[PDB]
């Protein structure tokens, strides 16, 4: 057979940078809750917006926002 | 001793697990609480920093209160079945169940309902 080419640069699947008990949401009083950012208009509450410099999206609908918030 | 020692929550949890209607974990629980899904709420007592528990409480408050004490979480998890096979009997690797919320229920009536009622009406 013919020899393999060998440029060098390999690309692996990203490990994702997992993070839980994320700093979204808050509570001040104790009794009631204070939501941070916002929930989805398309789907029901529980899902939360992605916040960037005048650009939003959500993951349950893979990524489908446009309007600011 | 024929009377149940808070063993009409564990049973419910088991049932939920069997029929696949358990929001285990915190985010999931929160989600359940938010929409027409989360019917019974199950928060850990021994929480470091008190924060998760507080959150759970808040969630419960927000619209309809479905909360209960919970006996250390680990026990609950064990009851549910957190572990594959685990030899012939028992011998499951211990896991903290964390926050749990019930969807679906499945099974009807029995002592669980009574317990819920008791918790509610004051
Ligand atoms: Mg080739
Ligand atoms: Zn969405």
From Swiss-Prot, chain A:
A zinc finger (C4-type) spans 40-61. It comes from the Eukaryota. Part of the 40S ribosomal subunit. Component of the 40S subunit of the ribosome. This is Small ribosomal subunit protein eS31. It comes from Kluyveromyces lactis (strain ATCC 8585 / CBS 2359 / DSM 70799 / NBRC 1267 / NRRL Y-1140 / WM37) (Yeast). The chain holds residues 82 to 150 of 150 of the full protein.
């Amino acid at each position: 057979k013919k020899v393999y080419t060998t440029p060098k640069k390999i690309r692996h699947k990203h490990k994702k940078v997992k993070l839980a008990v994320l700093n979204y949401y808050k509570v001040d009083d104790e009794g009631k809750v204070a939501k941070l950012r916002k929930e989805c208009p398309n789907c029901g509450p529980g899902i939360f917006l992605a916040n960037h410099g005048d650009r939003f999206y959500c993951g349950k609908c893979h990524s489908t926002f446009a309007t600011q918030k | 001793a024929e009377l149940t020692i808070e063993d009409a929550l564990k049973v419910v949890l088991r049932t939920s697990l069997v029929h696949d209607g358990l929001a285990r974990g915190l985010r999931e629980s929160a989600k359940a609480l938010t929409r027409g899904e989360g019917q019974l709420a199950v928060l850990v007592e021994s929480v470091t920093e008190e924060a998760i528990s507080k959150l759970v409480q808040g969630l419960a408050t927000e619209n309809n209160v479905p909360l209960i004490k919970v006996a250390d979480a680990k026990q609950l998890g064990e009851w549910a079945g957190l572990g594959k096979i685990d030899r012939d009997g028992n011998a499951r690797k211990v896991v903290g169940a964390s926050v749990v919320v019930v969807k679906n229920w499945g099974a009807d009536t029995q002592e669980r309902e009574i317990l819920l009622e008791h918790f509610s009406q004051q």
